[PDB]
């Protein structure tokens, strides 16, 4: 099965440069073209350009020119993208999509990559403070409060993925250069306190990964 594996999240200060990858699998790398699409927080979809994957030939959008620089590596079936002079408007999700056979360098884009998140700012990366949310003295809702962290993203699971039902993880919000996120989990009023319930929140940016057991008050 075709698969475009995009590098993890990044965080750079304005004017700094970032380079992201896009490793392919399940198909002949050098037979297609790889494009790079940008998607602002707002949910737009800008075209950055494409790469040949075989000859290395490239083409950009007069808008991203000079700023974006595509690169390709045949030995590792990997596509790269160099971003320079980054502003706050660059803080978006960058994708890499492969073309269809016969169309050449033009779309459609049958396959897309994970998607790389990029945050540009001078704010210092701060680890999150996870707080357990136990009901104040048939279904019982519990949760965790991930406060004061930077930058995005943050992975929060329950019982290491065990609990997947009745789980609601809300979008982080900004408190002046610092995020705050929460997550709730509904479970029948029996596996708790009887059985253990824990939230697993990870902040890659700071390599932080803490578990918090929700005990009664």
């Amino acid at each position: 099965g075709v698969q475009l594996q995009q590098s993890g999240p990044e965080l750079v200060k304005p004017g700094a440069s970032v380079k992201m990858s896009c490793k392919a699998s399940g198909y002949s790398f050098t037979d297609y073209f790889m494009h790079w699409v940008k998607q602002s927080h707002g949910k737009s979809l800008d075209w950055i350009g494409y790469i040949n994957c075989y000859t290395g030939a490239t083409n950009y959008s007069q808008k991203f020119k000079g700023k974006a620089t595509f690169t390709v590596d045949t030995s590792s079936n990997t596509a790269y993208m160099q971003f320079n002079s980054l502003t706050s408007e660059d803080s978006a999700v960058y994708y890499c999509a492969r073309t269809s056979i016969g169309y050449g360098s033009s779309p459609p884009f049958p396959y897309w990559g994970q998607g790389t998140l990029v945050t540009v700012s001078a704010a210092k990366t701060t680890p999150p403070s996870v707080y357990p949310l136990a009901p104040g003295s048939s279904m019982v809702t519990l949760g965790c409060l991930v406060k004061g962290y930077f930058p995005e993203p943050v992975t929060v699971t329950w019982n290491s993925g065990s609990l997947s039902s009745g789980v609601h993880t809300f979008p982080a919000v900004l408190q002046s250069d610092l995020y705050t996120l929460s997550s709730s989990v509904t479970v029948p009023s029996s596996p708790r306190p009887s059985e253990t319930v824990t939230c697993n929140v990870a902040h890659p940016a700071s390599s932080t990964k803490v578990d918090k057991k929700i005990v009664p008050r």
Binding site: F33, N52, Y54, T55, I101, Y103, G104, S106
Partner: protein
């Protein structure tokens, strides 16, 4: 009357890039639903569809060359350029550029299944080999005999007998590409046993040889 003509380098070295142009008249890429595609044909092989471009600038390339072929049109100059990068010995063949009729319109709306007009075809040879004259060896013994135009490059090479006096029974087979990257053909002639010179000429290497066969 529609006309088409392929133009470009008759010879190219491996890895380099080949650029073929299709000159035409009798219609314009301004015409609706009209396209111009390319069809390649290796020596003694079947036809292979390469690509095709339309008035609307649409383009489609053979899955095999999806990243080596680039088709462009010059609506003005009435031309259609095709660029093939990283060429190899497997790309030597005759390239034809045909025209595809357009869909019947109705006030400008389509309401085509073939390449009605073709070109003359241009022969291209992808090789690194250098030009050199052919060696002529005799094929001494109805009765048969002939000459072996050896190790030459590139095609073609004209061969006649006795300044033309001979024809009956002469068989000049098509050259073969040797491992050397050079060619080699044999021109025989069958005549009466009781009846007991090949005029070889290699244009490029200006190698003209009229050997005798005893």
């Amino acid at each position: 009357r529609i006309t088409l003509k392929e133009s470009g380098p008759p010879l190219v070295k491996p890895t380099q890039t080949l650029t073929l142009t299709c000159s035409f008249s009798g219609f314009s890429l301004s015409d609706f639903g009209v396209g111009v595609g390319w069809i390649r044909q290796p020596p003694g092989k079947a036809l292979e569809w390469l690509a095709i471009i339309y008035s609307d600038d649409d383009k489609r390339y053979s899955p095999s060359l999806n990243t080596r072929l680039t088709i462009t049109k010059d609506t003005s100059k009435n031309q259609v350029v095709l660029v093939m990068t990283r060429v190899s010995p497997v790309d030597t063949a005759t390239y034809f550029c045909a025209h595809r009729r357009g869909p019947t319109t109705l006030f400008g709306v389509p309401i085509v299944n073939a390449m009605d007009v073709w070109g003359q075809g241009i022969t291209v040879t992808i090789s690194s080999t250098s030009t050199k004259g052919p060696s002529v060896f005799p094929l001494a013994p109805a009765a048969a005999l002939g000459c072996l135009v050896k190790d030459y490059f590139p095609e073609p090479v004209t061969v006649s007998w006795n300044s033309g006096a001979l024809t009956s029974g002469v068989h000049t087979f098509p050259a073969v590409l040797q491992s050397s990257g050079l060619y080699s053909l044999s021109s025989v002639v069958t005549v009466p046993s009781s009846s007991l010179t090949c005029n070889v000429n290699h244009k490029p290497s200006n190698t003209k040889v009229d050997k005798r066969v005893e």
